[PDB]
């Protein structure tokens, strides 16, 4: 039940480990972009929420 | 002018006072590089 651009599925995600390598080593999706960071090092330098 | 271009990424950092002029498609993925543009290999010279 994917939402539309006017009203999104606002998912505020919190303390957990986000395995960007899982989404990066698999080409299931057509295009992956991440701002100014390689996906692999995305698993090393981390953030708040 | 569109001739002036830099390097977007490569294997690791550059040793001081060293020049790299290689144009091989950098393999930014676990999948082996196919030698052309794809989903894991991109042209290093942006």
Residue B28's Cβ-count burial label (10 Å; 0-12, 13-18, 19+) is buried
d(CA B27, CA B33): 5
**Residue B26 carries which DSSP code?**
E
> Is A34 in CB contact (< 8 Å) with chain B?
no
**Residue A44 carries which DSSP code?**
T
Of B28, B30, B39, the CB nearest to A38: B28
Of B9, B28, B39, the CB nearest to A27: B39
Chain breaks in chain A (C to N over 2.5 A) after: none
Cβ distance B11 to A40 under 8 Å?
Answer: no
Q: State this model's resolution in angstroms.
A: 3.1
d(CA B45, CA B26): 9
């Amino acid at each position: 039940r994917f939402a539309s651009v006017y009203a999104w599925n606002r998912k505020r995600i919190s303390n957990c480990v986000a395995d960007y390598s899982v989404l990066y080593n698999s080409a299931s999706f057509s295009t992956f972009k991440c701002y100014g960071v390689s996906p692999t090092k995305l698993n090393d330098l981390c953030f708040t929420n | 002018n569109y001739n002036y271009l830099y390097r977007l990424f490569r294997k690791s950092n550059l040793k001081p006072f060293e020049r790299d002029i290689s144009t091989e498609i950098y393999q930014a993925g676990s999948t082996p590089c196919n030698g052309v543009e794809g989903f894991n290999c991109y042209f290093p010279l942006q």
